[PDB]
Every structure is written in C-alpha cells, then in structure tokens.
C-alpha cells in the first residue's frame with residue numbers, strides 16, 4: 001500500500017562541517033597503524049542509504065498480533081503519567097541541541113530565557129488548536145565512525161536522521177517524556193532491555209537459559225527498522241500511549257504530535273529545500289526508542305505465538321531481540337524460526353541476517369554483543385558481556401580538530417571492563433596516554449544513552465568493581481572464540497598483537513604504582529593480569545559508596 005519515503009531530488013546536504021582526517025593522529029597512532037581503514041559516514045553517502053530505505057510496505061496482521069496488542073494496552077492502562085512543565089521539558093534539552101529557526105538555541109532553552117519560553121509556549125498552543133497541519137522536519141546524514149569491511153562492500157552509507165525544530169522537541173518532552181520513563185518498563189517488565197547494566201544483562205540471559213529444560217535461543221534484528229514502521233504502527237503506538245491514565249491536555253497534544261509529526265511529514269535538507277515526504281518512523285523524535293521497542297515487542301511476541309515458540313523469554317532493545325525458549329527438537333526449531341520470520345515479515349519487520357536456532361549461549365549475538373565465559377585462576381566459570389572490538393578500535397582512532405577519541409576509550413573501559421581487549425589494549429593505551437599528558441586526575445565524560453556522567457580516571461577501579469565485581473580484575477582464561485576474534489580484530493587494524501600489549505601494560509603498571517596514591521591502586525587492580533605473581537585484591541570501600549543506577553538505564 002504505502003511507500004516509506006518519496007523524494008523530490010534535492011540532495012541530503014551536510015549540517016555544517018564534515019571533518020577531514022589529519023596526516024598525524026597523535027593520540028592513536030601508537031594504538032593501531034591502519035588508519036586508512038577508519039572512516040566516517042558522510043552526507044554524500046546519504047543518497048545510497050535513501051535508495052536502500054525506500055520501499056513499499058505491505059503489512060498484514062492476524063489474530064496473534066491482535067491478541068498481543070490487547071494484552072499490551074491492558075498493561076499500559078496501569079500507568080499514570082503527568083505532563084511535564086514547559087520549564088522541565090526545557091531543561092531536559094542537551095546543552096548542544098540543534099538550534100531553532102526562531103533565533104534561539106539550547107543555551108536559552110536550558111536557561112529558561114524569555115524569548116525561548118515564549119516561542120515554545122506558542123508552539124504548544126498550536127499543538128492543541130491544530131490537530132492536522134504537518135510539522136516540517138529536517139533530514140541529515142548521521143556521522144559515525146566504522147572500520148572498512150571489504151566483505152560487506154567497503155564503507156557503509158550514512159543513516160538518515162529526521163527531526164523537528166527545537167521548539168517542537170521541547171514540546172514532545174512535555175507531552176511524552178513521562179511516558180517514555182514508565183510505559184516501556186510497564187508493558188514489557190523484565191523483557192525491557194535498556195534497564196540492565198552489562199553484568200545484569202548477563203544475569204538475565206543466564207537465568208533464562210537455565211530455567212529452560214532444553215534451552216534454545218535466537219537473536220533477531222529488523223532491516224532498516226525505521227523505514228519498516230507503517231503509518232498504522234505509529235497510530236497503534238498512539239493508542240498504546242492513550243491506554244494510560246493521562247490528563248486530557250496531554251491526550252490532545254499526543255494525538256496532535258502523532259498525526260502531524262509521527263505518522264509522517266515533509267522533510268527539508270539543511271539548505272532549506274524540500275527534500276522528500278516521509279510515511280514512517282522519523283529517527284529523531286522523542287518516541288524513537290520507546291516506539292521502536294514497544295512496536296518491536298508487539299510484533300516479536302505475536303510472531304512467537306505464530307511460530308509456536310514454547311515458553312519464550314525475551315530481551316528487547318530497540319529492534320534487537322533475544323528469545324530463549326524451550327527447544328522442540330532441532331528439526332522443529334528450524335521450522336519454527338522460519339515461521340517467526342515469515343510472520344515478522346508479514347508484520348513489516350523483515351529481517352537483516354536471517355535468524356537461526358542456537359544451543360550455546362556464546363553463539364547468540366544481539367545488541368552488538370554476546371555473553372562469553374572466562375575462568376578464574378582456580379577454574380571457576382565467570383560469565384560476562386563482550387563484543388567484536390573492531391568498531392570500538394576504529395572509534396578509538398577517530399581523532400580530528402573537533403573530536404577527541406579519549407571519551408570513546410573511557411566508555412569502552414567502563415562498559416566492557418571484563419573483556420580481554422579492554423583489559424589488555426584499551427586500558428593499557430588509556431593509562432599510558434594520560435600519564436604522559438599528566439592528566440590522570442582530570443575528569444572525563446562518560447557518554448551513555450544520551451546522558452553524560454563525569455568520571456575521574458583514577459576512580460576506574462572502584463567504578464569497575466561496582467559494575468562488574470572483582471571478577472573483572474581476575475579473568476584468567478578466555479574462550480577460543482574471544483581469543484580468535486580479538487587477535488583477528490587487532491591484525492585487521494594494524495594494532496600490536498596481545499603479546500606486545502602485555503609488555504606495554506607491565507610498563508604502564510610500573511609507572512602507575514610508582515606515583516603511588518590512587519594511581520597505584522589503578523596499577524594494582526587494573527593490571528594484575530600483567531604480572532607473574534598476582535596480588536590478592538580486596539573489595540574497595542569506595543565502591544560500596546557508588547550509585548551508578550542511572551548509567552545503564554533510560
């Protein structure tokens with residue numbers, strides 16, 4: 001029936017400057033050598049992405065979908081949600097959010113400047129008086145760094161980003177922020193990923209696996225998910241939102257945003273010319289993550305009933321999906337997954353990589369990560385979350401006039417502290433760089449899920465123990481898969497082999513311990529793996545004083 005996009009012909013032009021790589025990368029040219037392999041998606045490739053996301057969606061639902069949606073609206077009805085004040089919505093604006101056509105930006109929005117507070121006030125009234133006129137949006141290509149894969153066709157084109165004016169974005173937080181904070185948790189319960197730290201995510205999947213008698217898992221991911229979201233999906237989202245207990249003023253504005261913004265509208269490039277019309281999810285609205293995850297949950301759960309998946313346990317993060325279920329035999333499990341996919345395709349959530357039943361937890365990869373197992377020094381299995389380090393290493397090398405890789409490094413040391421590649425590569429290079437700059441004690445910003453938390457490099461032992469436990473400093477033996485991948489990835493980027501990093505780390509640790517104090521605590525805990533005769537590590541008192549609750553949530 002409906003096309004996800006249609007285009008006028010105007011190019012998807014850049015939002016200001018697109019950085020040039022430099023001839024010397026002085027913070028990462030001692031980390032790896034093949035900098036030619038590290039690129040950034042640019043607005044030029046946006047045309048290629050546009051072709052790949054423009055297609056006719058033909059959705060066909062059934063009594064399983066219908067049934068699931070009923071159950072989810074009923075779960076939704078248990079939620080009560082408030083309007084946010086204009087002032088509170090204003091103050092959730094990030095400090096550098098794209099400015100407004102109306103002569104103000106994030107600085108004035110966050111500071112409750114009168115010109116801004118006024119304009120937003122009238123933007124809001126228009127939402128309650130006008131339930132129909134489309135709201136214009138800007139389309140820009142996303143700038144993200146990857147490592148070239150010639151197997152996957154050179155460089156990836158840039159994802160398409162579609163957002164309204166800053167004034168509108170404040171208004172959606174007034175109407176919908178409180179619901180984003182409560183609805184996903186409410187209708188999915190423990191199935192909602194985006195509430196788990198890496199260690200917690202591992203507990204959940206481990207616990208799921210073990211309570212199955214003959215467990216079987218698979219992961220699923222949708223192909224160009226935003227462009228698969230039908231107009232009917234987005235209104236079905238509105239009805240899910242309206243299931244909750246809401247002030248009538250919210251309901252009006254929620255419906256108005258849905259009809260004028262979420263179900264679609266015209267897009268303008270950064271030069272200002274009409275670019276195309278959109279009839280799918282705009283990745284850029286406040287409801288992007290919540291919409292994605294709830295709509296993915298409905299279809300995925302409907303398809304589970306369609307394919308006869310027995311005793312499913314799900315984990316949903318956007319459009320990434322893990323299902324641990326009871327295995328009906330290898331023969332039936334393959335047939336069931338084909339049914340799941342045939343159903344998901346009928347619902348307009350077609351797959352990228354076709355899913356496949358697996359019976360070993362390490363073999364299931366979703367959210368760009370997988371559980372893996374390492375032994376302690378005595379033989380105790382410890383489980384943990386890891387990933388292919390290729391993209392983290394590539395972003396470790398993105399280094400230009402306007403961007404520093406050092407935050408990237410921190411975020412991986414925090415998020416993947418138990419991994420062999422963080423412990424031996426990133427941690428070593430991180431602490432070597434900061435010592436030489438004599439910036440060990442200078443705060444860095446850790447970035448996760450839009451928020452931004454200040455951390456002091458010398459607090460990493462306490463932070464890591466609070467997040468992953470003391471097992472993060474004592475993984476002795478890693479798995480055949482993990483060793484194979486990390487070795488491969490380091491070769492692929494011209495980084496030294498792990499053998500060399502062990503040498504480098506002994507030096508770093510020496511220097512850390514030498515300067516005593518909190519630096520020496522980092523040397524002893526974070527680098528205990530590097531020395532022949534390991535020190536007995538004890539719990540850190542400061543770790544018990546640490547509230548990281550908000551770090552890995554939304």
Ligand SMILES: Cc1cc2nc3c(=O)[nH]c(=O)nc-3n(C[C@H](O)[C@H](O)[C@H](O)COP(=O)(O)OP(=O)(O)OC[C@H]3O[C@@H](n4cnc5c(N)ncnc54)[C@H](O)[C@@H]3O)c2cc1C
Nearest residue numbers: 288289292317318319320366367368369447448449450554
């Ligand atoms: C609501 C939300 C807001 C985010 N805002 C920012 C930001 O402002 N600046 C920044 O640099 N990073 C942002 N991110 C990315 C995030 O901080 C991490 O880099 C990464 O998503 C967390 O690790 P992952 O294992 O989920 O990686 P992934 O495998 O890439 O994530 C898995 C799933 O999470 C969803 N997802 C991934 N990236 C985004 C994204 N940008 N926005 C919405 N959903 C996404 C997708 O549905 C994906 O299927 C955001 C992520 C979410 C979920």
Ligand SMILES: Nc1nc2c(ncn2[C@@H]2O[C@H](COP(=O)(O)OP(=O)(O)O)[C@@H](O)[C@H]2O)c(=O)[nH]1
Nearest residue numbers: 142222223224225226283284285288292318319
């Ligand atoms: N607002 C916003 N949403 C994103 C971003 N990246 C991914 N998403 C959302 O998550 C969806 C699926 O995630 P992804 O792995 O990238 O799948 P893809 O769109 O099918 O290539 C995307 O279509 C987006 O709606 C981003 O950078 N910003």
Ligand SMILES: [Mn+2]
Nearest residue numbers: 221222319320
């Ligand atoms: Mn995905």
Ligand SMILES: [Mn+2]
Nearest residue numbers: 222223224225
């Ligand atoms: Mn996808």
